[PDB]
Design a protein around this ligand. Structure first.
Ligand SMILES: [K+]
Ligand SMILES: [K+]
Ligand SMILES: [K+]
Ligand SMILES: [K+]
Ligand SMILES: [K+]
Ligand SMILES: [K+]
Ligand SMILES: [K+]
Ligand SMILES: [K+]
Ligand SMILES: [K+]
Ligand SMILES: [K+]
Ligand SMILES: [K+]
Ligand SMILES: [K+]
Ligand SMILES: [K+]
Ligand SMILES: [K+]
Ligand SMILES: [K+]
Ligand SMILES: [Mg+2]
Ligand SMILES: [Mg+2]
Ligand SMILES: [Mg+2]
Ligand SMILES: [Mg+2]
Ligand SMILES: [Mg+2]
Ligand SMILES: [Mg+2]
Ligand SMILES: [Mg+2]
Ligand SMILES: [Mg+2]
Ligand SMILES: [Mg+2]
Ligand SMILES: [Mg+2]
Ligand SMILES: [Mg+2]
Ligand SMILES: [Mg+2]
Ligand SMILES: [Zn+2]
Lengths: 131, 135, 51, 89, 154
RNA sequence: AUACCACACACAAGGGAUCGUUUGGCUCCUGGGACGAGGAAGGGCGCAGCAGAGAGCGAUAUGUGUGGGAGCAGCAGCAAUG
RNA sequence: AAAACAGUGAAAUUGUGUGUGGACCCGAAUGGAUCGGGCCCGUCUUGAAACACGGACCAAGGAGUGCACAUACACU
RNA sequence: GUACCGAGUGAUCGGUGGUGGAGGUAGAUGCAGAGCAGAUCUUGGUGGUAGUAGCGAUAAUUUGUCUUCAGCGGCAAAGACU
């Protein structure tokens, strides 16, 4: 049960809040679980998927496959994974997008600011965990 | 399906050949497409059917009602009960002399198999037995 | 006619730049849902009221 | 006759664009606008509630009024170079 | 894809269909009606004579107040007509099926027009001005067409 | 009635009812009740690499500072020197 | 003013094919000619098949409700 | 939603086979914007009449030749008119 009356439980309001999200709230939509080993290598339980990271598909047509993230579509919430595609009548191949939550991370791309992003989150935990 | 209630076997054909095939179509439903066939009583000041002139059609009424014993009886000599569960057949266990079962349309294939298996061992007649499960 | 005031001329200039169809590249954009520009006009069918 | 043939003579134009309201309703001979009463200081009485709500605050852009509300929320902080003047006052 | 209005085998038949054509509906079905069950070479010969005013199309359903003519006697009626615009279209359509027949490996002969039908397409709107300040409709009535020809068993 | 007119059924046309769905409306409750001579409210005109309408913004028409952090929806180009 | 899903896709109305009839309904039948009975509904009116008025056709919408005050009945 | 078949004096109810592609009832009670043929009803869609009525006041048009791809369109030569 919910006892805070400032938070809404309306279906109409929850749905609008989802689809009209922007900025950091949009980034929260692209989160995926880490594998059991990585959850010992790092403190975090889940992270936003980025290009170059390595993922196992755990639901759908392409179940059991593994591959590298090629692109991240923020407007239509989908991820393109290397080697997951369909062939047209022409023989031409189109990558099919997968929803973030159907993936699981196997190796992290550590290019750019990723190491600082991870550090910032670990500290935020401990700050309140140790109190 | 060619089955009959054993208590009425030597009588069922007299009963069936005795049932009326009269229809009570709404007045002038033959004249304009916007009036459906479903019965409504005419209430006009001039109307020839309400006033019962010879040559107009007949109106419904209590005189046409069937004898209390024959009423509701299917052509195989049983009355019907609707079922949708295995636990429904359990009700018929005392009544199987006069009543038979008809599985509701929305019950799917996997479940129908379980209903029919139970019907065989309890000794209950099911009239939709073939149903969708012919394939 | 040939004689015009400055106020009348600016109204004509603005009414002439607005009178154009949707550019052909926009139709390819994923989010774009318009078919035809309903604000397009013809001199044979409407008056501007520039007077 | 009073129908079609009299329509041919209708080539003069009594109203032009008003400089206060845009509405092509300034009567040149009377020296008055029929929408907004220019050049009188106050705006005209509008005929009914339906017609007046079409021209109320919030029907346009409200540029100044929106900024003022944001500044009030923030506590009227002013330009940060000049904090010392603010603090003294 | 197109669901032709009847069932005949793909082998031993040839087909065509068109949509929204801009020949006039009522004229076209009077043409189609008379060439049904006719042999294809006979059909093409007959339609050539209509273009030259040497033979006519007889009329039976869309026929009120039509003219009488000695050419109609060939079909046991008095009433006939010469709808040039519809005839030119149907003739072209039939000639193309002989190309298809030849290319498909049937004979150019023993082909018979087994099925042919015309349907109404949606109206194209227009206007005319009337008296006393009125405006009245002035619309156009196009058509859709199917043909299937088969080889005689003989 | 060979071919016209009517009705029934199957297939193709013609129209948008019905059933399933909804980032909208309405009602009640609670908060709020903040404009202008330091030029308001309202009107017009300009500003995009390809740009009509609408949205955003004023010739500084995506500038400065703080907190964050991964892409910019099409095509060509940009981006941890943000 | 109109305009929701690139869903489902009714009726009026049209073409082709196959059958049955010559406005149609009720009662009763034949291998087959048909026999008997029936004027067009709604409405005001002493009185409508009317030379009384409304109605070309189909879909969807479309008319005894809410509050206050006395009241008789049934129920607690 | 559409064909058939059964149950009821009747308002209506049930099943079977194709189409459709995600929701739906049976019993007992509660609240109502709760049932249509009609109102020269309201909105939207479609017939018969009908390939019919009409489309041609004014100076007038012919021949060749190219396009057009089938425009008395253009160009030459005549014939007219304001
Ligand atoms: K019956
Ligand atoms: K009477
Ligand atoms: K009785
Ligand atoms: K002028
Ligand atoms: K004009
Ligand atoms: K005005
Ligand atoms: K005022
Ligand atoms: K007809
Ligand atoms: K639709
Ligand atoms: K459809
Ligand atoms: K009356
Ligand atoms: K009389
Ligand atoms: K009257
Ligand atoms: K109705
Ligand atoms: K009535
Ligand atoms: Mg004058
Ligand atoms: Mg004057
Ligand atoms: Mg004639
Ligand atoms: Mg005229
Ligand atoms: Mg006029
Ligand atoms: Mg009288
Ligand atoms: Mg009338
Ligand atoms: Mg209704
Ligand atoms: Mg589904
Ligand atoms: Mg109502
Ligand atoms: Mg004539
Ligand atoms: Mg003269
Ligand atoms: Zn003014």
């Amino acid at each position: 049960m919910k006892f805070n009356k400032n938070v809404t439980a309306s279906r109409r309001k929850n749905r609008k809040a989802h689809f009209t999200s922007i900025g950091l709230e949009r980034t929260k939509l692209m989160n995926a679980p880490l594998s059991k080993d990585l959850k010992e290598e790092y403190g975090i339980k889940r992270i936003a998927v980025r290009p170059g990271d390595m993922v196992k598909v755990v639901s759908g047509e392409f179940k059991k496959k593994e591959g590298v993230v090629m692109k991240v579509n923020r407007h239509d919430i989908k991820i393109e994974v290397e080697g997951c595609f369909v062939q047209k009548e022409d023989g031409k191949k189109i990558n099919k997008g997968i929803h973030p939550s159907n993936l699981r991370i196997i190796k992290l791309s550590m290019e750019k600011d990723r190491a600082e992003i991870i550090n910032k989150k670990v500290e935020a935990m401990k700050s309140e965990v140790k109190a | 399906m060619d089955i009959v209630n054993p208590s009425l076997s030597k009588v069922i054909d007299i009963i069936n050949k005795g049932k009326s095939k009269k229809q009570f179509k709404r007045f002038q439903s033959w004249r304009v497409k916007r009036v459906s066939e479903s019965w409504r009583k005419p209430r006009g000041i001039d109307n020839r059917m309400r006033r019962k002139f010879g040559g107009a059609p007949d109106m419904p009424g209590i005189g046409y009602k069937k004898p209390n014993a024959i009423r509701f009886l299917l052509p195989n000599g049983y009355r019907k009960i609707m079922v949708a569960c295995v636990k429904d057949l359990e009700a018929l266990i005392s009544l199987n002399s006069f009543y038979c079962a008809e599985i509701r349309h929305a019950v799917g294939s996997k479940k129908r198999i379980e209903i029919l298996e139970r019907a065989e061992e309890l000794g209950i007649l099911v009239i939709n037995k073939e149903g969708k499960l012919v394939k | 006619g040939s004689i015009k005031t400055r106020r009348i001329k600016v109204q004509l200039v603005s009414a002439l730049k607005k009178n154009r169809c949707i550019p052909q590249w926009k139709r390819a954009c994923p989010g774009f849902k318009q078919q035809y520009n309903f604000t397009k006009r013809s001199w044979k069918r409407k008056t501007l009221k520039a007077c | 006759s009073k129908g079609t043939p009299s329509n041919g003579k209708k080539n003069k134009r009594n109203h032009t664009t008003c400089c206060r309201c845009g509405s092509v309703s300034f009567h040149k001979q009377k020296g008055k606008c029929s929408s907004c009463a220019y050049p009188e200081k106050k705006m005209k009485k509008m005929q009914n509630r339906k017609a007046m709500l079409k021209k109320t605050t919030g029907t346009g852009k409200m540029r100044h009024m929106k900024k003022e509300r944001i500044s009030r929320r923030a506590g009227y902080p002013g330009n940060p170079i000049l904090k010392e003047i603010r603090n003294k006052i | 894809a197109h669901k032709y209005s009847c069932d005949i085998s793909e082998a031993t038949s040839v087909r065509s269909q068109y949509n929204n054509i801009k020949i006039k509906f009522k004229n076209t079905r009077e043409v189609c009606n008379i060439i049904k069950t006719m042999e294809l070479n006979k059909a093409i010969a007959y339609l050539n004579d209509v273009l030259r005013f040497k033979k006519c199309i007889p009329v039976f359903r869309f026929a009120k107040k039509c003219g009488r003519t000695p050419q109609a006697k060939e079909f046991g009626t008095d009433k006939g007509k010469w709808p040039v615009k519809s005839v030119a279209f149907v003739k072209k359509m039939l000639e193309d099926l002989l190309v298809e027949a030849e290319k498909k490996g049937l004979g150019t002969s023993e082909l018979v027009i087994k099925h042919i039908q015309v349907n109404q397409a949606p109206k194209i709107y227009g206007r005319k001005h009337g008296a006393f300040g009125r405006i009245k409709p002035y619309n156009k009535s196009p058509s859709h067409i199917e043909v299937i020809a088969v080889k005689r068993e003989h």
